[PDB]
């Protein structure tokens, strides 16, 4: 008793029932884990300095307000 082997019938209609979802936006899931290491290490050092400057700025803004 043989039977069908393969078909793609009705598959396109099923996929469009809930539609082809759009791709994720460019600003999400944008890590660079597997990238070129020498540039990644340099960026980490700059990011650490930037965080230190951000903390100091809020300290100065608050102290100015308390006057």
């Amino acid at each position: 008793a043989k039977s069908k082997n393969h078909t793609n019938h009705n598959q396109s209609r099923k996929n469009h029932r809930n539609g082809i979802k759009p791709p994720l936006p460019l600003y999400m899931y944008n890590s660079k884990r597997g990238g070129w290491l020498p540039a990644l290490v340099n960026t980490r050092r700059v990011r650490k300095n930037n965080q230190k400057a951000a903390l100091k700025a809020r300290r100065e803004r608050l102290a100015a307000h308390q006057a």
Binding site: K14, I20, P23, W36
Partner: protein, 157 residues
């Protein structure tokens, strides 16, 4: 027996054009790439190293990583009822800079020049006029077309 190897249908896809064989030229070597650029992925077929899979031939995407002899590109691909962002690694010979945004950038520059001219008082170029309106048509002579019965004898081989 079709077989599903890495290049299972690429007889005409991965072939060079007529009288255009050879290896990449110098201008291709000095291209330079930056993260965030738009590139087209096209196989060269003369450089076997770092060739992308046949699906990604003729696809456009954004580069996310640069290595000494390679470029990483993000490309959309639809699977079932969704689309996946795939990351592929290719050699620099198989990528070209994309001109898919040059019309948009030119429009922005024109608008900026419009503002500068208005604020500097510079006269503006005159507006183009559509030809879909009416008008007078005065012809020197009028011809006729009436199926002159020589065409009927003409379409006989």
């Amino acid at each position: 027996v079709h077989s599903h190897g890495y290049k299972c249908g690429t007889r005409h896809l991965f072939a060079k054009k007529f009288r255009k064989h050879g290896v990449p030229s110098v201008s291709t070597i000095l291209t330079n790439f930056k993260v965030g650029d738009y590139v087209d992925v096209v196989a060269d077929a003369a450089v076997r190293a770092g060739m992308p899979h046949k699906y990604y031939h003729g696809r456009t995407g954004i580069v996310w990583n640069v290595t000494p002899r390679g470029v990483g590109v993000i490309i959309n691909k639809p699977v079932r009822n969704r689309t996946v962002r795939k990351r592929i690694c290719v050699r620099f010979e198989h990528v070209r800079k994309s001109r898919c945004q040059e019309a948009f950038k030119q429009k922005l520059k024109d608008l900026e020049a419009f503002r500068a001219a208005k604020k500097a008082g510079t006269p503006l170029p005159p507006k183009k006029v559509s030809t879909r309106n009416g008008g007078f048509v005065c012809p020197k002579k009028v011809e006729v077309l009436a199926r002159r019965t020589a065409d009927y004898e003409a379409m006989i081989p």
